[PDB]
Design a protein around this nucleic acid. Structure first.
Lengths: 146, 64, 51
RNA sequence: UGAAAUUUUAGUACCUGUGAAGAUGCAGGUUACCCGCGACAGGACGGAAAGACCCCAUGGAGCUUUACUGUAGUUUGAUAU
RNA sequence: UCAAUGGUAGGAGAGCGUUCUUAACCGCAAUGAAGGUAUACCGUGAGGAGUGCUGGAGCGUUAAGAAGUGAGAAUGCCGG
RNA sequence: UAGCGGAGAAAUUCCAAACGAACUGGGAGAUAGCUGGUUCUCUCCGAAAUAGCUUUAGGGCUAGCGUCGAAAUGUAAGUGU
RNA sequence: UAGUCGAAUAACCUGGGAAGGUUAAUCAAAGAGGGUAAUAAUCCCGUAGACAAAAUAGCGCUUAUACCUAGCAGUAUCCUGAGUAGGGCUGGACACGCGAAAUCCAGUUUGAAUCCGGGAGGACCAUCUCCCAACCCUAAAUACUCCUUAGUGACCGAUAGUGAACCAGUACCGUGAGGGAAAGGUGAAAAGAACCCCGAGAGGGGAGUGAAAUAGCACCUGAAACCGUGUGCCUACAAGAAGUUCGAGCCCGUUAAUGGGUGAGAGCGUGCCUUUUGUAGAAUGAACCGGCGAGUUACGUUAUGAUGCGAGGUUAAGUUGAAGAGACGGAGCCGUAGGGAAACCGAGUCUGAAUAGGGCGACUUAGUAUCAUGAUGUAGACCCGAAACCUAGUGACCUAUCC
RNA sequence: UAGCUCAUGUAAAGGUAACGCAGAGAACUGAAACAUCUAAGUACCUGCAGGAAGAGAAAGUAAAAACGAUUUCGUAAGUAG
């Protein structure tokens, strides 16, 4: 197509040459109307501004300190167990060798949501919810948490 | 370089996925004499953020 | 080939239409440029191996 | 012999009105051969002077003070010498 | 066929022209490129070529990309 | 004798055709809710000049007021009579 | 650090000149590029390759030498880094603004233990982990170029590009610190106009020159404002944003066209810009003409599309390589359930005695990556703009003081 | 002894493109003003160095088996604070 290079839709359109001419104009104005703090250079206006009044967020109470020892388990559905059958010893090796999520929060967890297609018992976990322990442990599972 | 998240604004707010933000109540810290018995019954909890306001979210409370 | 022929290749730059290329030459400015080309018949393991 | 300031260009009259509310240029009406030349100042809100009067700017300087913060400096006490 | 088409700040869409684009496509050029000039054509517009003349070296196509990119106007500036 | 300074028969007087804060270089294209400027062509649609707050009143922030796109059309709401 | 060799062509047409057009032929590690009176592969420089340096500054390899190190069990006691750690106060840095404040480094003061030791583990007290300061040196991967070339350009073409293509930091200003300009092009080749005539001279005019003399020394090309000279029509009873529209009459004949140039006369007609509620303006501003002269990109987010694949998309940095591409590189990042401050729980979760209600939740159904466009945010961030602030430096010949 | 004299050793004074290190070190800004902060320990200034400099060998990090001097880049990520 090097004889007659052509472009398709959507990827291209004119970058709006704003600030020349008579038709769109916008160099006389740039959409703006003169004689105001809006009407000047810089674009200098802070976003959160109640007109010198304190802002919405500035009226907020200081709520809840944060546990430095906050740690989770990169929780997956049981719908990926619907993908893989059985994958005996369902573990992090099945998880990241399944390439579901690779950078994980150390353990693993499934939902009770997702379906009981799997058959294997020896699911190696750190912590699965007891709602899902009802599902798989009532559905031919064994608990191997950590 | 990056766009700096305001960490104290993040300490003001907490937003949900597929939904709005939770805003804790005003008035609820400093005096409690003149605020009513019913306002004590009800203003421990609080409602959500606005709709036509708060669009100055962008993007001062980015990705927290 | 990808063993690097050398005789049209240390030459034929004065042959005004000759474009010395390998499997390590692939672009669209490679091929849409000339549109007309000769092949070394190792083109399975010179084409398929990633493609 | 030979410049300066100067300005949308203009073959640029008068009255009475009108009008960002005082007309050369507009409406109505009047008088005026065409082009000059020497002197004069009523206009052309004449120039030259982004008002030095007043006002404003979250404007700045300078000054004053028992403004508030300070600073040096002055004077205690501790303490190594 | 019917209906619509005053329009400023506003917002949307689309197109023109300049220059560089190795690209190609593919020519012009001393019998005259570019550029200038007159021109009583065309194109809704921006704009486009025809001829006469100057003029004696680069320019045009197409299509697409990329842009220090579309000129009155500011005590704009510089030069006359 | 040199600028946070100097000089001073003292006015705020001068410090090289010249000063209530000198001149030169850098910070630093200081900054400027205030002035001016903004350049090719067309089509379509089409304003506000208000409420509330505000060291705010010649400025912002919402809301009312336009435009385009998308999701259905609260199963019609809209708008008349 | 001197350079050396280095291939491959002829004619015709045109023109002042061929490399241009035309006819043919060659070459091949050289059809990069530049000159040549006009565009060259074969005309030349060159180019690709292939050789060349004594002195020249080096780099690198081999050689014994150019010298100080090892393991090892046991533990007589010593050693192991004293005003040192520390403690007080005052500081500062560490993200750390005295704070719960770590930890380090200062001043000042006080002052250990020392191997059964001592230190750290964000006040701190025990258990555990690690280490051994208070002695000294350490290449490498990194930062930046005045410089030396080899160079490359979707750099730029004489207001640009360095202030400076030009004898530029020049002229010039100012005592000084400082500032700071303007300007390149004849023709291929000066072949630069012999001579002759006018003219005081210059300058002209003939001749001749050259392809060309409107080509004649600031010389290619030559607008534009300005001044002209000629030209067809009209105007010396007229008081106009200087116009239309119609048009008497005249003149001329064209991007061959229901031609043009006029224009008496006659109708109706308040220049352009910013601001404003409204300016025709006696509201600004513009002498004119030409040139320059202003919404970007760096990175980030959001929105909208385009494409790709899809609960799977995605490689960053880097490596490779021609500043190629491709390929490698999965480190990491996005989505793939949230609820609650948190403990935690979990398709439910929190709130609440509630399993009551309410709250957010799958119900409530796909994104990811890239591009592109708009807006965003840090960057002077659409520009033009002060009076200002501080640092560094210069200055007593004006003038004031003093000797 | 001070002090003085002689002799020997560029040593070494000095010129320096940019980068570095170390000391000394602001303001303007912005925070809609501003006294906290920021700007930045950046502008400047002085000294010390080389081709690079510093840089460095745990009196380290971390928190479980967890490694084993530094340095640069990406990440973590504007995450913790």
């Amino acid at each position: 197509e090097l004889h007659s290079l052509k472009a398709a839709e959507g990827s291209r359109k004119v970058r709006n040459r704003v600030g020349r001419g008579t038709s769109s104009g916008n160099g006389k104005t740039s959409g703006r109307g003169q004689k105001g703090q809006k009407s000047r250079s810089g674009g200098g206006v802070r976003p959160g501004f109640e007109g010198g009044q304190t802002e919405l967020f500035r009226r907020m109470p200081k709520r809840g300190f944060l546990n430095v020892n906050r740690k989770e388990y990169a929780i997956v559905n049981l719908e990926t167990l619907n993908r893989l059958e059985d994958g005996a010893t369902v573990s992090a090796e099945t998880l990241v060798a399944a390439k579901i999520v690779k950078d994980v929060k150390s353990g693993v967890k499934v939902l009770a949501n997702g379906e009981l297609t799997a058959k294997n018992l020896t699911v190696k976990v750190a912590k699965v919810s007891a709602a899902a322990k009802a599902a798989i442990e009532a559905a031919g599972g064994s608990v191997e948490e950590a | 370089p990056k766009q700096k998240t305001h960490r104290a604004s993040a300490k003001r707010f907490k937003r949900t996925g597929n939904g709005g933000l939770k805003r804790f109540r005003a008035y609820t810290s400093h005096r409690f004499h003149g605020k009513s018995v019913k306002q004590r019954r009800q203003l421990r909890k609080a409602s959500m953020v606005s709709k036509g306001d708060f669009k100055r979210i962008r993007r001062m409370v980015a990705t927290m | 080939p990808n063993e690097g022929n050398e005789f049209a290749e240390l030459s034929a730059r004065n042959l005004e239409n000759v474009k010395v290329t390998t499997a390590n030459s692939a672009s669209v400015l490679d091929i849409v440029s000339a549109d007309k080309l000769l092949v070394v018949q190792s083109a399975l393991t010179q084409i398929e191996e990633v493609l």
